[PDB]
Design a protein around this ligand. Structure first.
Ligand SMILES: [Mg+2]
Length: 234
């Protein structure tokens, strides 16, 4: 049987932006025989950095399930796009930008982005390589969300800011990836997250953990990712 776990990153796997704290977690999960799938709002460029740093070479899912990346020849990258291109999102944000005082990646400076996100300077370039979504760092007037929703977009609160994306989510992407594993055998699925963008995942796995206080029906709350591992041991 295949044990697979979907791991969110920000505010779930690591405290901040440095990968180091997660090394022990990934090693332990690997020793326990898990297939570790990152499923984060982070861009593919950002996740490739974490993957390389943590030696994770499994499929991963980016920008709130907007795309599934499967390493060439992984199953006995191949990209499955499920969201919408970021240029279409920016076209609409541009129209709303000066109506709602919006600040997002496309209209903010590296400096602003660092201040908004608390991101280490050297990592900001990976965050700016967006393919299917935007992040709203701030606004000066409410109402833009309703407008984007009616325009066909999804607005989902993440670990730090709202994310504007297309017609997909972490669960739709997880569900599709889970089918690939099912062709290989029986699966015991887990999901670990921390915010609203993680809810769609919870609806598709057997066991669910939430790091922090956000409550969810099918989810068991814990204070940290370490706890998740302890619980799993049993
Ligand atoms: Mg998160």
């Amino acid at each position: 049987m295949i044990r697979l776990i979907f791991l969110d990153i920000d505010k779930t796997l690591i405290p901040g932006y440095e990968p180091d704290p997660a090394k022990p977690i990934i090693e332990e999960l690997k020793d326990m025989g898990f297939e570790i799938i990152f499923n984060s709002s982070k861009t593919r460029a950002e996740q490739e950095y974490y993957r390389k740093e943590l030696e994770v070479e499994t499929p991963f899912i980016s920008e709130n399930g907007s795309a599934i990346f499967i390493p060439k020849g992984y199953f006995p990258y191949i990209v499955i796009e499920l969201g919408i291109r970021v240029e279409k999102i920016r076209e609409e944000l541009k129209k709303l930008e000066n109506i709602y005082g919006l600040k997002y990646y496309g209209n903010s400076t590296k400096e602003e982005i660092e201040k908004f996100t608390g991101m280490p300077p050297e990592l900001v370039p990976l965050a700016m390589e967006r393919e299917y979504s935007e992040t709203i760092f701030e606004w000066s007037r409410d109402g833009w969300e309703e407008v984007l929703v009616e325009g066909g977009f999804k607005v989902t609160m993440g670990s730090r800011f709202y994310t504007v994306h297309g017609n997909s989510d972490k669960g739709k992407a997880a569900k599709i990836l889970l089918d690939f594993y099912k062709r290989l055998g029986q699966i015991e699925s887990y999901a670990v997250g921390d915010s609203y963008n993680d809810f769609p995942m919870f609806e598709v796995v057997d066991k669910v953990f939430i790091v922090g206080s956000l409550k969810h029906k099918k989810a068991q709350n814990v204070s940290s990712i370490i706890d998740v591992l302890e619980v799993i041991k049993h």
